[PDB]
Each structure stands twice: as C-alpha cells, then as structure tokens.
C-alpha cells in the first residue's frame, strides 16, 4: 500500500526537518548568531513533534509505522552566510508541504477521509510556515545589503 | 487561473455583503426599528472580518488580492416593510454560501487541500447563517400579521 | 439530493442504535457485578446519543428533513457470556458506526457537498480514536482472563 | 411475580419511548423555527431519558431482569401542523406515562412488594407536576394562538 | 441641499480611505513589511468607524442616507516601495480633510450649528493623522537612504 | 585532541540514537496496546534528545565542530514479541550509553581536559541512576509476567 508507505515517508519527513533545523541552529551558534540559533532549536522541536502527531495517529489508525534512518543534514556544508541558511530552511519547509500534498493525494485517490481530516491542520500550518520563513528571509535578504546591519535583526529582534 | 480569480471574488462578496448589511441598518433605523438595526449592524462588521480573513489567508497563500470595487446596495430602493429586508438578507446569504461551494467547487478540482481546509468553517458558518436568518424572516412573517405586533419584538428581543 | 439525505437520515438511527448497544452491555457487566466496566459502558452510551443528537441539529440547520426511526432492539447480550464476548461486540459496533459514517461522507463527497463533509470531519477522528480504545480494552481484557480473578482485578 | 417483572421492563421501555417522542417534538418545533419550545422539548427527552436509566439501575439492584426491547418511532409528528398539536401529543403521552407508572404500582401493591412501592413514589409526584406543567403551557398556547403571531411572543420567553 | 450632498459623500470618502488603507495593508504584507500592514489595517477599521460615525448622525438627523460604490484602490497598482504607500495614504489624508473642510464650509453657510458640532472632533483627528502620517513618511524617507535599515523601522513596532 | 573532537561528535549521534530506539519501543508498545509503558518510552525518548542537545550546546561554547550524522534506524523492533524483549533492549541501550560516555571521559582524562570532564559527570551519575531504573523495571516484567495476564495488571496500574 502506497498510502501506507507515504505516511511511513511522512513520519520521516518530519524527523528529517527537525534535524536540519538543528543543523541551522549548530551552523547560528557557531557564527554567533544567538538569536536565529534559538528560533532554529524551537522549530527543530516542533518539526519533531509533528512527526510524532503522525506516529500516535498511525498507531491509532493499525498504520504500521517502522522508523526509518534520519539522514544527516547537508546544506550546512555549503553555508556562508545566515541568507543561505534561510533559503535551505524555506527549500525545507516547501519540500516538507510537497510531501504532506503527495500524502493527502494517496489519501483522497483511497477515500480515507480520516487521514483527510487528520491532515487538514497540517496544511494550514504548512501555508503560515512558508509563510514565516519567506517573509524572514526578505528581511534578512534586505538587511544583509549593509554590513553589519543584520546583526542588529538578530539581537533585537529574535 | 480560475481559483485566483474566484478567490478574489470570494473578497469582493464578503465586503459587498458587508454593505448589503448595513444598508439594510440604515433603513431599520431610518424606520425606527432599532434593534432589527444593531442586528444588521453587527452582521455588517462580521462580515467584513470574513473578508479579512480571505484577504489574510490569500496574503500567506501568495494568491495575488486586487481589491474590486464594493457596489453601491439596490435592493435598499425596494423596501417597505421589515419583511422585505429580512427576504433580502436571507437571499444573500444564499448567494455567499453559493460563492463559497463554486471556490471549493475549483479547489476540488485543482486538488488544493490547503484551500479546502481553510473553507470549512466557512462552509459551516454558511449553515449557521442560512438558519439564522430563515428563523428570523419565519418569525417576522407570523408576528407581522397583526398590526403593531411585530414592533413590540424589535423593542424587546435583538 | 435523495441518497444523501436517507443515509444522514440512517446515521441518527445508527448512533441511537449504538446508544442502546452500549446500554445492553451496561445491563450485563451490572448484572454479573462488573461495575467498572458497566460505567463505561453507561458513559458511552450518552455519548452516543449525544452524537445522535448533533447529527439531529445539524439537519434541522440544514433543512434535511428528520424522521425518526425504530431503534432496534439489542440482540448480542443473548449469547455474551464473559467480559470478553461483551467487548468484542463493542468493538464490532464502532467497526460498523464507522463503516456507515464513511459511506455517508462517500455519498457527501459524490454530492459535492462541503458542509457536510466538513461537518463529519470531527466525527471520522473520534472513530479512530472510539476503535483504538475499545481495540486495547479488548486485548487487556483478552490477556488477563487468561488468568482466575484477574480480570475481576482490571474492573 | 412474571407480571410484576414484565411491567417493569415494559416500564423502561415507555421512559424510552417518551424521549424519542420529546425528541421528534424539538424537530418539528426547530425545523418550523420555535427554538424555545423545541430547547425544552429537548431537555425532557434527555429527562425521561435519565428516568428511564433510574428504573433500569433499581432493577439490576433488585435483580429484576431487564432486556432492553426496540424503541418504537414516534408517530404523531406526520399529522402535527401548528405548536397546539405538538403539545397536546405531549399531554397525552404524559397522561400514557402516569397510567403505566399506576399499573406498575397496582402490580406492586398486589405483591405486596413495598421496595418497589417506594421506589415508584418520587416517579408518581413527578408525574402530577409533570401533567401540571404540560397542560399549563397547553392552555397558553391555545390562548395565544387565537391571535395571528402573538404565540411567536411565547416562543421568545 | 448640497449640504444632504456632501454629508452623503463624506460616508463614502470615509469607506473609500477605509479600502485605500486596507490596499495599503495588502501591499505590505505582500512584501513581507508586516509591522506597516497591521498599522494599515488598524487605520482601514478607524476609518469605517469614521463613516459608521457619520450614517449614525445622518440617521438621527434625518439625513437621508444612501450608500455608494466603494471603488477599487488604483495607487496600489504603481506602488514599489514603502515610501510609495506612505505617500499615497498622506495624499488621502489630506484629500480626506478638505472634504470635511468643505463639509463644514456647507454647514457654515446653512447656519446648521449640529453639523459644525458634530464635525468639531473630526477636524481635530485629521490635524492629528496628517501630522502622524507626514512623520512616519519622514522617517520612512531618511531612513530608506540606506540599504535595509527601513526594514528596521517595520521589526521595531 | 582529534580523537576528543570525534568522540565527542559520535557521542551526539549515539543519544540521537538512543532517542531513536526509544521511540521504536514506544511505538512497539502502544501497536501491542501497552499504553503505559509506552508512555515511559516516549518520555526517556524526549530527554535523550534534550541529552544529545546539551552536548551540542557544550561543543559549540567549546568550539568542537559538531557535524551531525546519519540516525539509524531502530532494528530492535524486528525481534520484539514480549515487553520482556523491548526493555531487555533497552537495558542493554543504557549500557552502551554508559560505555560511550566511560570513553568519551577517558579521553579527556588522558587529554587533561578538565572542561570536558566536569561537563561529563552529571551525565556519569545519571547513567547510573538509568541502569538501575531499567534494571529494575526488567526485573518486575520478568517476574510478573510469569503469570499470564498478570504483566498487564502493572501496566495499566503502574506507569
Ligand atoms: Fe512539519
Ligand atoms: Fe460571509
Ligand atoms: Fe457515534
Ligand atoms: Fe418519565
Ligand atoms: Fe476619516
Ligand atoms: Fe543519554
């Protein structure tokens, strides 16, 4: 079952994010952005508890659930500045809407209008996700024209 | 695209019922009919938060909102009794609730689960609303079969 | 349109149908001194009238006409003779509450009918969670009368 | 006795019958837009409902064996046409409802089973009040509606 | 009466600033200056609290009240930076004033002493938003000389 | 101090780890309708992941590069068919816990680094305090479950 495998996929998705959001932490910490650092390590947890939303509901729901690897993250490598950082972690959170989409596909193509409804929140925190990580990464993209001035986003702001 | 043009016409009905509303208050209180008036007042604000909140979601959504213009109310022109208003009312809501299935109606088709879940309460406020109203044209109607009758539950209920 | 409005019609029938199940179980465990598992029992049972109920204020709201039907008499309770048999009876009747809550959200879908769908969307979760309930009750229920009296012990 | 033990599930069975009945009450007054007169006719389903489940605990209590039977579908609310119908079917089944409380005890009485004869007496003093209360709104009603709309006036209390 | 004339167009006047301001909002938004577009969007509520102030009096006074078109916001189409928007919500502003100048001029001539009372709180509001809008165009216009510091001012409040 | 840097980064990754099996035996519990025990799981599933975070924040104040590594998947699960199985597993989980934080300290003693060293002997204590909880937890399932049904009765109460 396709269905199945997606949220077995979906579940690792989540985890997936929650570790590349840590990595953005690590790479803000390390260069001294303290700010962004913490708004990373917030979001990192939060990714994780999503996933674990779709575990306790799989579990509900006889979905078997085995957890996959978390793959390490990548991007971190190649990053030099926090715009980069911004723009991996907006590359995540519309790959991770991608993926929520392809579940919410498979569930409709079944009829499963439990996993529809379960689903429905989930969206909507995808659109203000997005949302939130464009608009910061604006400022930043903006900010980041005058030295040293972004910062000042990070110690105010953040 | 047929979703972003009928979401923005989505906007523009909320705001022209907005209107519809409160020209319906200004004959009530032109009339002397002060509470059907503050019913019809409050109904005008609410209304317009429900165009906010298009406008908010479409803001996050990246669906592009060109604001229409708001037409000037007509059926304003026709009234003579509280019932005509009331039957007025009643039809608008019937055409909000029609606007809103011909936008889930696209994003269905369009497979846009977002959307539809950003729909929903929308959809059930529609049936709160359709029966709210109806209730209140069924009990105009009854009480205005004796004169004088009807103005005694302005003064009291509302 | 016609099938749509009979199946919301039958849900009302089906929730007060499963209102008096949950009764019937309620009479047995009291009967046979399980008072523990009979309060649960009688719990669910409001329950699912009151489910009953918002589906009832629901259709009146959206002027699908009502008409109340029969509520069958229960029938399991003949042949129940451990704990077990009473909640796998149970667990048989939420696996059928949500077999008909998904056919009806199939017919809704058919009739492009949003408010509806969107009014069952609370109501396919609370199955998934009513099955997963009485699933572990039914397993704990099943393991430990493996043993004399311990069952007797869980109530 | 067999027909003490009948007459008492018989007797859960009318509290039952009674709720459903209230409830197709509340139906016919809010699809017909009397929210006030279809709140309380909700409210007294739920009632007899309660009633009903309080024969069904004193029975497993005395060991009066209980087997739920079919609640019957009400059938007054195809010919009801205005509130004054409604509440007549109402009085009616209260009227029902104090006879088979009365035949029970009679059965009681016979057998000379005083725990039962308790039991029921709460149940009869409800049933006056009850009666009292229905015909009371009865006659309201059937006042106010000799005046076109003034009953919608009732409805709003 | 020209006065009925102007009173009427007055609640238009402030509907329309109320959908410039919230064209105003979108605009922000759009570009992620979410600090700008909450001030818009509370100033687009002041605004339909201002026409909703002025269809009360007409109302109690007899004016006769008819609704108009909102029409579309137009700047909102050649807008590309903040300083844009603020320009053109000032020019509302000030727009905004002298029709309520012309209001009272009407008011004035017509000896209709309740309108020139009535309007008193509202010229002295529009002293006070032209100020408020002329200085955050101010600060918005030095401090967009240099590349992304404006997008300090948005953040800061 | 290579040496150091690595055992320090493989460490980060083994409470990643340990998280990571401890939410296979939660789920292992809760599919076998183990409620309670799953419960706990999931619970000492969280604090090894806000143990691999404290980790994290000590290198990075130490400025010991931490390059995050692949978590991976549970395989324990497989094999599950009692409780007894799951928290056998995850006694021996602690063990290994243990084990890597013994290496990671000595060497840091053979480096001197007394920073490291300090850091470390809340999380020696607490392996202690770990072993002995899940130990004992072991001990009472494999006793109790001698008796069928019995286990359950402790699940449902107990947890
Ligand atoms: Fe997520
Ligand atoms: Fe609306
Ligand atoms: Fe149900
Ligand atoms: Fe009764
Ligand atoms: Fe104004
Ligand atoms: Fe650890």
Redesign the pocket.
């Known amino acids: 079952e396709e269905l199945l495998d997606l949220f077995n996929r979906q579940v690792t998705q989540?985890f997936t994010?929650s570790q590349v959001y840590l990595s953005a932490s690590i790479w803000f910490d390390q260069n001294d952005w303290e700010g962004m650092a913490a708004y990373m390590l917030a979001e990192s947890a939060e990714?994780r508890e999503?996933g674990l939303g779709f575990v306790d509901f799989a579990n509900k729901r006889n979905i078997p659930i085995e957890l996959q690897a978390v793959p390490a993250p990548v991007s971190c490598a190649e990053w030099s500045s926090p715009e980069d950082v911004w723009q991996s972690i907006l590359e995540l959170e519309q790959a991770?809407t991608r993926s929520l989409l392809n579940l919410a596909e498979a569930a409709s193509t079944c009829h499963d209008f439990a996993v529809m409804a379960f689903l429905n929140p989930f969206h909507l925190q995808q659109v203000n996700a997005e949302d939130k990580i464009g608009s910061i990464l604006a400022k930043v993209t903006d900010e980041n024209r005058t030295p040293g001035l972004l910062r000042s986003l990070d110690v105010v702001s953040f």
Chains 1, 2 share one sequence.
């Open positions: 989540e994010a990714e999503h991770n």
